[PDB]
Amino acid sequence: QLICVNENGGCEQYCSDHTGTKRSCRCHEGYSLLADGVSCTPTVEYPCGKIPILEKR
């Protein structure tokens, strides 16, 4: 079965398809996956693709 093809499999960042209806969401380096299994949260002060002056205000 195919899951990632449909709306990035619900993933905030990266989607990986596994055997059957299994789907794994992943994050870029400097991020970790939340227990919801879809969201990515920064693990560092300056994660890629985020604007600190906008994030801090």
């Binding site: 380096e29 604007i51 002056i53």
Partner: protein
């Protein structure tokens, strides 16, 4: 950048300024502390390979405010398929001699995975393009970093909406059009190598590189950008390699 605005200082923190003998050469995009993505055509005329500098956290060219970080470029990696003076495969991967320090003004843009970029990012209509390029075709370059929001087009639509011009280069699968055909808004030659950045669910990603066009903001024409998604694996493999003597390196593509 034609018909854009000043990017407020720190709002384009991945923007790179490339210099040769202290002179403005091109733009680039920081993708981590060591690596910069730019355009291969930026290096066609380089003789002084040892005088290449990447400046991060740059905003205003007329003053030093203390947020700028300069690094010597240790390597310029260009795909084997790129032919100098031509348009296809216009990408360069630059290795900095030492990492930059990430601060509020120095932050990488995410290099996305290929499938996510092809299936999701390719369909986000608007993306930001930036640089210290020409404010007008055949006009002065910018002193403050400029930014412009541009819509992306499917290549068939780009070709139909463009004025037919003799000897115009082909728009390959390694490129995409973005911009306006009304002569009001576009990136220019001085923005070459600079980012085309795409927003998705609170994060910005690298999807294109300022590459080429018929003049700058020419009626009947769109800006043409390197389609970065075609190079993800090629970039990832090279980022894992050891540097080699000599700044310029031609690497096999695919």
């Amino acid at each position: 950048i034609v018909g854009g605005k000043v990017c407020p200082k720190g709002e384009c923190p991945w923007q790179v300024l490339l210099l040769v003998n202290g002179a403005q050469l091109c733009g680039g995009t920081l993708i981590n502390t060591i690596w910069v993505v730019s355009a291969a055509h930026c290096f066609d005329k380089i003789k002084n390979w040892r005088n290449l500098i990447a400046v991060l956290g740059e905003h205003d060219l007329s003053e030093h405010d203390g947020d700028e970080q300069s690094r010597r470029v240790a390597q310029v990696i260009i795909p084997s398929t790129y032919v100098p003076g031509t348009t296809n495969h216009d990408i360069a991967l630059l290795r900095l001699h030492q990492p930059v320090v990430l601060t509020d003004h120095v932050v990488p843009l995410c290099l996305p995975e290929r499938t996510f970029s092809e299936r999701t990012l390719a369909f986000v209509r608007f993306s930001l393009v930036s640089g210290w390029g020409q404010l007008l075709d055949r006009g002065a370059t910018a002193l403050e970093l400029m930014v412009l929001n541009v819509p992306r087009l499917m290549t068939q639509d780009c070709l139909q909406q463009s004025r037919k011009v003799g000897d115009s280069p082909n728009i390959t699968e390694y490129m995409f059009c973005a911009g306006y055909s009304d002569g009001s808004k576009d990136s220019c030659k001085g923005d070459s190598g600079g980012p085309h950045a795409t927003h998705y669910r609170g994060t910005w990603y690298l999807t294109g590189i300022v590459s080429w066009g018929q003049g700058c903001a020419t009626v009947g024409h769109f800006g043409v950008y390197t389609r970065v998604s075609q190079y993800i694996e090629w970039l990832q493999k090279l980022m894992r390699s050891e540097p080699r003597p000599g700044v310029l390196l031609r690497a096999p593509f695919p």
